[PDB]
Design a binder for this molecule. Structure first.
Ligand SMILES: [Zn+2]
Ligand SMILES: [Zn+2]
Lengths: 48, 96, 114, 209, 147, 182, 272, 97
């Protein structure tokens, strides 16, 4: 009931029913949560 | 004989219960590991657990070795009677 | 220490100070009757409760058939082998597992702790 | 006694210097970075019946754009501040023709003096700061992301780019501790830059209401 | 206790409890109290003997029954809060005999440990080899079994 | 139908309630159930919630209304051993709270003032409280006016059990103990 | 351990063995046996036995175990009592040599009644050490990398260090952040409203996100970040903590038909 | 990019959720085109850098030519671009893939 109206608009912005901006891009990256997978950066951990 | 030293931050009852629970959990885990090691390659319990279809290593341990400690509200079985669990046991009996 | 009662009316004594004289006395307000006090303490408060329970526990618990009993610890005065043991009941102490012992014989009311 | 009060005063002064630097006021590197021993030597160690009385501590700093716009920071002598004391500060403020100032209250302020503060708002703006709030810089906490006060031109560009009316933005209330730290007005828009574990970085815009 | 066991002027309905530490003695003739029969143990020996079993095995055409067993002082009714003062032995042949003794002051003995189950749970074969939730499911489903 | 047992004193402890300990005795002579409560207030003093009476009443006022003027007799019914100072220290504030009432008729008027109404006259006010204390207070102990002494003992036992609960000398009664049920 | 003792709330009751009120009319002719041996030291050149001094004596005993566990000083206790109450009590106290650790206190309300009230105030409220609303403080070395300090070495590697951390029962975040040698950057609490009132709204956003992630992933399950982020953003969008209840959701400026379908059906339409 | 990652990810947790699985994709390419790791490669190292640079322009989350839009696009695709550059390193391409 609290979230029922939150929705991705055609601006790719996330707005509620009053058009108030909740997120400027969905998920802060604009990607759907079903096509993503786990991966390794491979640059973070190594020694210099 | 009041020889048990209370762990910092924890009451004497808390550390006594912790030690007994530690001992019993170690026993149950050792017995379960032994039972799992004793399983043959033809055992259907192992064939079901290894493939992950249904059941688990604790299920095998309880079936073969030891059902284990029984807990009420995350604690060992309380004293519903005055100072004992059932009328068959003696008062002030903290044994397993 | 604790309550004392007036003789004239069986009511509480409570303390008053002899203003002209600097001696404490007990005076029951329901009458004139007075007592210069023996108790130079009027109020004491055992905040830490370090007290052992030997006075609260009593010899008749020796007759409880559901209590455990061992021959290991002998009584001091008679040395009868049988002695029933049980745990503390004080809610509020630095310890919670010490055993209170009572001599089991019908004619030796004697008690100890370990 | 006296050493602890000195330590508290040194922390408060350092936090106030960081405050002024973050607000865009000309603060020299030495004033930003002052060792405890240096502050102790400058202001004379023990405060109680000693050289750092509270009135010894007041700060005048100049803005980078214009040196005419100057901030005083006051450190009241009294555990609680009254209308009389605030009127004395305002009289001095008018005599020095300055427009902005802070007050560092040791315990708290009477509501009548708070109302006196807001009554002055179109003329002279005074901001209350409790002593404990200035004992640590909340901006350096790990939970607080980067805050940047936007100019009116930047706000206009933002609203033209996203075609947003001002009320459609996320909001931040004026009583927010970060909004108190940056001295942010009703109607201004803040820019928050925080790291994200999906994108890497994310910018949020809050309207101050 | 002697009068209750002799049924003389105290009905076996009546429960008597002595709380030694609190120095109280409570007697209940009240209705609604749940109770169960138990065998009396005197010293380390049951009061139930081979002659009682012989007479009960010849129960037919002997007018000797459970009421005659009660009147002999062999079995006793005990309710919930009298059990607090009762030392129960799970079985006679395995807790009355001398060992490195757990207890020697046993006062009562269960008839059979399987008497703790209800009507629907008494049809379960090997109920001690199962998980308790499954026993509950069977107890619930037995009321729906057709016959 | 399962229900709590009657005529037996129980002691419990509520979390948020103004009382640290609440002793009660659901009493039945075969009739609707006349529950007295005897409670100990938190930050300590003892008050009673009598049936058909508006508000709490101090214990000493009730005891004096029962006909026991003297503090010795009241504490002798409450405390069975005068050699224990902790019990005296626990009871003392309750005595001090009800000092302003010293006469039995004054106590009866005090109780009647908190009745279902104050009666029309001093005699009807005092009469209503006497009827409530003889008919509605502890009916299983007795109903004939001689039994007030026995009623006093039972009330003293209730208070004594509450004091025992307050001293930690006894364990609080378990409500799900199936022997406490009928 | 020093920080632990400085952080934990300790009342005078915890270190007090027992208390007794005596009648001790004259300074020198005391009721007690040992106090003659310091009463003489105090009254042979009497400190302020200049006005009259009251017949009623208050006498608190202090357990040595608790006294030395918390690194207390009887001089510290006397200073704190005298400062908290002013000059309206005279404090007489022993050197640590005395085996029986005594703090002899002397003063409309009657003398003993006021002195009993003093005792009942001191035991409960004296607040000897630490920060109140802090019941207990636990100290331990974390085994989990999320509580272990992880730093970058000179080779650019990630090295995990073990340092002592404290976990309190009860929350007062501001004064703990004020405390000497407490790390202000990383010190955090699990309370959301306390973080609000201390650090602001973005801090609540992040802390609420962390709490939700912890409570969801403690079971071992995994939930995508986007849903947690959306929940936190919706709760913190309007600038204050919008609880997901009838109050927080129906105080949004939405249509009355949306509100009547959640938890306040008739009242919403009546007000609209 | 390594410094940025070390700022973004303390504790050094390298597991990240990203759209397309580059290692699996490279392995797919290796198997589709029958690539022999035992033989020298014909891939010019300039083309690796140029292809990465041109691909990074075609992954648009925020569409626009304003500086604000450019900054938004960079913040949106920073992590994925860093990962893409790390995996499509010219040396890593020449040695492993
Ligand atoms: Zn008298
Ligand atoms: Zn003996």
């Amino acid at each position: 009931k609290s979230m029922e109206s939150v929705m991705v608009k055609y601006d790719a912005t996330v707005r509620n029913s009053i058009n108030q901006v909740v997120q400027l891009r969905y998920g802060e990256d604009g990607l759907a949560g079903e096509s993503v997978e786990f991966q390794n950066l491979a640059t973070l951990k190594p020694s210099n | 004989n009041n020889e048990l030293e209370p762990t910092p931050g924890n009451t004497l009852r808390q550390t006594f219960e912790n030690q007994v629970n530690r001992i019993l959990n170690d026993a149950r885990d050792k017995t379960g590991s032994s039972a799992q090691k004793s399983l043959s390659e033809y055992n259907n319990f192992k064939s079901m657990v290894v493939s992950g279809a249904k059941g688990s290593k604790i299920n095998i341990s309880q079936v073969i070795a030891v059902v284990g400690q029984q807990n009420v509200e995350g604690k060992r079985i309380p004293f519903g009677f005055k100072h004992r669990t059932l009328p068959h046991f003696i008062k002030d009996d903290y044994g397993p | 220490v604790g309550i004392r009662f007036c003789q004239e009316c069986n009511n509480m004594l409570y303390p008053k100070e002899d203003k002209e004289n600097r001696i404490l006395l007990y005076a029951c307000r329901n009458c004139d009757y007075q007592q210069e006090a023996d108790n130079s303490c009027i109020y004491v408060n055992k905040i830490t409760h370090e007290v052992d329970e030997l006075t609260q526990i009593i010899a008749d618990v020796s007759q409880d058939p559901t209590l455990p009993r061992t021959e290991d610890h002998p009584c001091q005065k008679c040395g009868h082998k049988e002695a029933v043991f049980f745990q503390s009941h004080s809610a509020r102490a630095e310890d919670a597992m010490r055993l209170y012992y009572v001599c089991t014989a019908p004619h030796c009311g004697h008690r100890w702790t370990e | 006694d006296d050493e602890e009060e000195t330590y508290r005063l040194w922390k408060i002064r350092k936090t106030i210097m960081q405050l002024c630097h973050d607000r865009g006021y000309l603060v020299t590197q030495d004033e930003l970075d002052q060792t405890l021993e240096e502050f102790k030597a400058q202001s004379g160690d023990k405060p109680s019946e000693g050289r750092p009385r509270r009135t010894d501590l007041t700060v005048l700093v100049a803005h980078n754009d214009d040196p005419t716009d100057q901030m005083f920071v006051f450190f009241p002598e009294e555990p609680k501040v009254g209308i009389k004391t605030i009127k004395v500060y305002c009289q001095r403020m008018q005599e020095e023709n300055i427009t902005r100032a802070l007050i560092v209250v040791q315990q708290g302020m009477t509501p009548s003096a708070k109302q006196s503060l807001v009554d002055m708002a179109p003329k002279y703006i005074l901001e209350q700061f409790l002593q404990q709030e200035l004992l640590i810089n909340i901006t350096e906490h790990e939970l607080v992301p980067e805050h940047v006060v936007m100019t009116k031109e930047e706000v206009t560009e933002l609203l033209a780019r996203y075609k947003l009316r001002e009320n459609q933005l996320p909001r931040i209330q004026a009583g927010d501790p970060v909004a108190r730290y940056f001295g942010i007005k009703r109607g201004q828009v803040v820019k928050i830059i925080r790291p994200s574990e999906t994108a890497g970085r994310y910018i949020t815009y809050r309207l101050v209401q | 206790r002697k009068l209750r066991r002799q049924m003389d002027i105290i009905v076996s309905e009546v429960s008597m409890i002595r709380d030694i530490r609190e120095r109280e003695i409570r007697i209940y003739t009240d209705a609604g109290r749940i109770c169960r029969p138990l065998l009396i143990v005197e010293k380390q020996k049951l009061l139930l003997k081979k002659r009682h079993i012989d007479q009960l095995k010849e129960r037919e055409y002997n007018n000797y029954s459970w009421q005659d067993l009660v009147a002999s002082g062999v079995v006793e009714y005990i309710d919930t809060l009298e059990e607090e003062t009762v030392m129960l032995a799970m079985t006679p042949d395995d807790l009355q005999e001398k060992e490195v003794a757990y207890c020697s002051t046993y006062t009562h003995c269960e008839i059979h440990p399987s008497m703790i189950l209800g009507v629907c749970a008494s049809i379960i074969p090997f109920p001690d080899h199962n998980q308790s939730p499954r026993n509950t499911y069977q107890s619930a489903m037995g009321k729906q079994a057709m016959g | 139908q399962e229900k709590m047992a009657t005529n037996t004193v129980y002691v419990f402890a509520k979390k948020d309630s103004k009382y640290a300990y609440t002793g009660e005795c659901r009493s039945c002579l075969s009739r609707p159930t006349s529950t007295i409560w005897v409670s100990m207030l938190a930050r300590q003093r003892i008050v009673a919630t009598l049936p058909y009476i508006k508000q709490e009443v101090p214990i000493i006022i009730v005891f004096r209304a029962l006909g026991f003027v003297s503090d010795r007799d009241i504490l002798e019914h409450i405390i069975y051993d005068f050699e224990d100072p902790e019990m005296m220290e626990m009871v003392k504030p309750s005595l001090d709270e009800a000092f302003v009432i010293q006469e039995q008729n004054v106590a009866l008027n005090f109780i009647g003032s908190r009745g279902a109404k104050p009666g029309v006259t001093k005699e009807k006010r005092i009469k209503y409280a006497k009827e409530v204390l003889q008919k509605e207070m502890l009916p299983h102990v007795g109903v004939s006016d001689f039994c007030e002494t026995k009623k006093a003992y039972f009330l003293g036992y209730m208070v004594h059990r509450l004091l025992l609960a307050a001293l930690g000398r006894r364990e609080l009664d378990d409500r799900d103990h199936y022997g406490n049920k009928r | 351990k020093d920080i632990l003792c400085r952080l934990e709330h300790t009342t005078l009751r915890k270190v007090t063995a027992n208390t007794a009120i005596y009648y001790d009319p004259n300074p020198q002719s005391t009721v007690v046996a040992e106090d003659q041996e310091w009463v003489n030291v105090y009254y042979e050149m009497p400190d302020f036995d200049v006005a009259r001094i009251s017949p009623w004596l208050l006498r608190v005993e202090l357990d040595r175990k608790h006294m030395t566990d918390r690194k207390l000083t009887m001089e510290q206790i006397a200073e704190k009592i005298n400062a908290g109450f002013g000059d309206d009590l005279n404090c007489i106290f022993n050197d640590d040599n005395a085996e029986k650790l005594v703090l002899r206190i002397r003063i409309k309300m009657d003398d003993d009644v006021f002195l009993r009230c003093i005792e009942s105030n001191m035991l409960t409220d004296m607040t000897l050490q630490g920060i109140e609303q802090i019941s207990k403080v636990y100290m331990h070395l974390p085994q989990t990398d999320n509580k272990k300090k992880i730093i970058i070495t000179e080779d650019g590697e990630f090295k995990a260090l073990q340092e002592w951390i404290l976990e309190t029962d009860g929350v007062s975040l501001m004064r703990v952040l004020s405390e000497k040698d407490v790390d202000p950057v990383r010190t955090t609490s699990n309370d959301i409203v306390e973080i609000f009132t201390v650090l602001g709204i973005e801090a609540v956003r992040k802390a609420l996100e962390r709490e939700l992630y912890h409570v969801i992933s403690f079971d071992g399950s995994y939930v995508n970040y986007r849903h947690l982020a959306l929940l936190c953003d919706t709760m913190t969008c309007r600038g204050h903590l919008m609880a997901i209840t009838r109050h927080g959701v129906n105080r949004q400026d939405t249509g009355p038909l949306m509100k009547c379908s959640f938890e306040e059906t008739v009242d919403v339409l009546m007000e609209a | 990019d390594r410094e940025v990652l070390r700022v973004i990810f303390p504790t050094g947790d390298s597991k990240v959720v990203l759209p397309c699985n580059l290692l699996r994709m490279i392995w797919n390419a290796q198997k589709i085109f029958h690539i022999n790791p035992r033989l020298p490669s014909d891939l010019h190292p300039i083309k690796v850098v140029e292809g990465v640079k041109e691909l990074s322009k075609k992954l648009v989350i925020v569409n626009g030519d304003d500086p604000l839009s450019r900054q938004a696009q960079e913040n949106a695709t920073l992590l994925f671009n860093i990962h893409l550059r790390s995996t499509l390193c010219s040396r890593r391409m020449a040695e492993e893939f």
